[PDB]
Design a binder for this molecule. Structure first.
Ligand SMILES: [Zn+2]
Ligand SMILES: [Zn+2]
Lengths: 316, 316
């Protein structure tokens, strides 16, 4: 007749804890709704004695938790925490070797796009805004990247195993980074129509899709004009700590000392594999846990990152 | 022995067409990969005589289509076009009545969050950047909103029928809008720590989560300081054509003439329904195709939109 109970804590951010007394004869789901223990779904499980004192994630189901979840993650997508937990149940089992001084990811679960994204982040100046990403990225740099990788999957609405694109993944991460001071001025010149200047800010100031070469972007790239002519677009002014140049995969030569790092994609629109190339004392190719070196590199490159501070054109 | 063929066109943007000759003895999938006809998946279907001359969507599977798709949609998520097509197969069957001069959506497929988002967009000054959204929004304002609604679902990574949050949906749409000139200056005052000013730009300058009242935001809202004290955050300067104030749903009184429009959510974290309230000559409550009016309004409000141009505080 005596209900037997244990004390547990619920949370949405793993920092602020909420004391609960749970009935050991009812499932966690009957008492909390969807409930997770370090990523594992315990909604249909009844409390174990070993659960006493442990922390469980729940969905934001009252106003206090709604505020805590938004302040930590900067999202109000109702499915976010469930997707973060579902990914974490996988990423906590991945291995994160140090390769040439950087945290990589041993290949598992079709994660090569995440490995090259993680390697790239550690080579560019970037600060995240959500505390969740600040905290997880700090841990990832130290070598414990499971929470960071699960957050990337959640913020990008990708599940473990799903085909991912590096450019799109970086776009999501940059949306949650402080790029407010970044600025880009472009000029587009048509022999018929004249010239038109455009200013871009934030994420749009550091990403370009169409050519891999920063030098070519400075000299001019050809794009369509609405009048039918081919116009020339070139970079007038750049203020940012890096730039990212992207293009559909094509054979491309990477020259030591002319770029920071790059992503290589081998395959087709439905199926493929990413590798990472970093330019240090030589060219290192990081493929998850694997490492090779070369003095020259040619391959199907999709994204190239360059160092920057301030650039102003000499084109009149 | 003579292979019988028809001419069709493939596309990723429904503007640029690519001539194809298809074998009538093979499925579209065998020849194009995943293939769609006005949203319907025809990958496993063989060509019909009536298909001659028609346009089919395909996935971006060569470099020309990759460039066309990015220029139109401003995304490189590999699953985007399939998700847009899957949603469109549903939204093309929805009805879009004019309610009090605005395009709404007759309730279907758990779409009430999309109806209030669509109604809101038509009451605030906002220009989209991707041509896909520019073109579809123009059609939606005219009353043909199927493509716009399917794009909202695709950009938000939501499927038809899935629970949606209005604040999160607006965040995705604002990410793809030109808000570059929007600016917000805030001051946070702690009696222990002093004062700290912060400047926000773009989407972060027009969205706030924590209170529904713009007036309260101007006077000051209480938030935690890291020292443990309660600090006061207030608006110093605002430059934008609207602001959006959001909070977890709570009973709230909407006063005629003090706001533009608002979203009301009845339910809980797993299940609920949205309605739209607009302040015109009186208060109109739009619930899909349904319309009621009242002189006063109280309900569980989640988001309130206000007109703005330039605001500067008088607080010293
Ligand atoms: Zn021209
Ligand atoms: Zn303080």
């Amino acid at each position: 007749r005596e209900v037997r109970t244990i004390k547990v804590f619920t949370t949405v951010d793993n920092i602020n804890l909420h004391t609960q007394v749970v009935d050991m004869s009812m499932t966690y789901g009957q008492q909390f709704g969807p409930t997770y223990l370090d990523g594992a779904d315990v909604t249909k499980i009844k409390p174990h004695n070993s659960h006493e004192g442990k922390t469980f994630y729940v969905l934001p189901n009252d106003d206090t938790l709604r505020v805590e979840a938004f302040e930590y993650y900067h999202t109000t997508d109702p499915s976010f925490l469930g997707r973060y937990m579902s990914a974490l149940n996988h990423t906590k089992k991945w291995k994160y070797p140090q390769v040439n001084g950087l945290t990589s990811i041993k290949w598992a679960d079709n994660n090569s796009y995440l490995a090259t994204a993680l390697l790239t982040l550690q080579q560019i100046e970037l600060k995240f805004n959500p505390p969740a990403l600040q905290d997880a990225y700090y841990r990832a740099r130290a070598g414990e990247a499971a929470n960071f990788c699960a957050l990337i999957l959640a913020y990008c609405n990708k599940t473990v195993g799903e085909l991912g694109d590096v450019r799109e993944t970086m776009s999501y991460l940059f949306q949650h980074a402080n790029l407010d001071s970044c600025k880009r001025v472009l000029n587009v010149v048509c022999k018929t129509c004249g010239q038109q200047q455009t200013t871009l800010k934030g994420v749009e100031a550091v990403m370009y899709m169409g050519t891999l070469s920063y030098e070519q972007f400075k000299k001019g790239v050809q794009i369509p004009c609405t009048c039918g002519k081919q116009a020339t677009k070139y970079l007038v002014q750049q203020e940012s700590p890096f730039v990212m140049m992207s293009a559909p995969p094509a054979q491309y030569e990477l020259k030591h000392g002319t770029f920071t790092c790059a992503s290589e994609y081998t395959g087709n629109y439905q199926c493929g594999h990413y590798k990472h190339i970093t330019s240090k004392e030589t060219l290192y190719c990081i493929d998850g846990a694997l490492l090779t070196k070369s003095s020259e590199y040619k391959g199907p490159i999709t994204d190239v990152f360059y160092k920057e501070n301030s650039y102003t054109t000499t084109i009149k």
